[PDB]
């Protein structure tokens, strides 16, 4: 009642709990879900071979 929600709003004049700029704070799940992994090239090595 004090801080509001999707249902209730009251106890603060025109106050709205602020809004996320990212749906998921975990980016591993986003990167590894399905479609990005479909849409990305294969990868190399975490550390490169040295040439010459």
């Amino acid at each position: 009642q004090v801080w509001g929600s999707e249902t209730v709003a009251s106890s603060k004049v025109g106050y709205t709990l602020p809004s996320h700029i990212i749906s998921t704070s975990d980016v591993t799940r986003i990167i590894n879900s399905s479609e990005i992994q479909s849409a990305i090239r294969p990868a190399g090595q975490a550390t490169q071979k040295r040439t010459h």
Partner: protein, 51 residues
């Protein structure tokens, strides 16, 4: 639809009662804003000094 926090009794003994989350806990957690607000707000019970 919300994680259903259980209520607990004074002598331990967790109750059979569970309440939804008030959405304040799905609010965003911004350490930077808490930082700035805290500095400015903790400056506000200050008391003047001068020679």
């Amino acid at each position: 639809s919300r994680p259903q926090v259980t209520v607990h009794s004074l002598t331990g003994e967790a109750t059979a009662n569970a309440l939804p989350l008030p959405a304040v806990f799905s609010a965003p957690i911004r350490p930077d804003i808490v930082h700035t607000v805290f500095t400015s707000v903790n400056k506000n019970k200050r008391q003047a000094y001068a020679v």
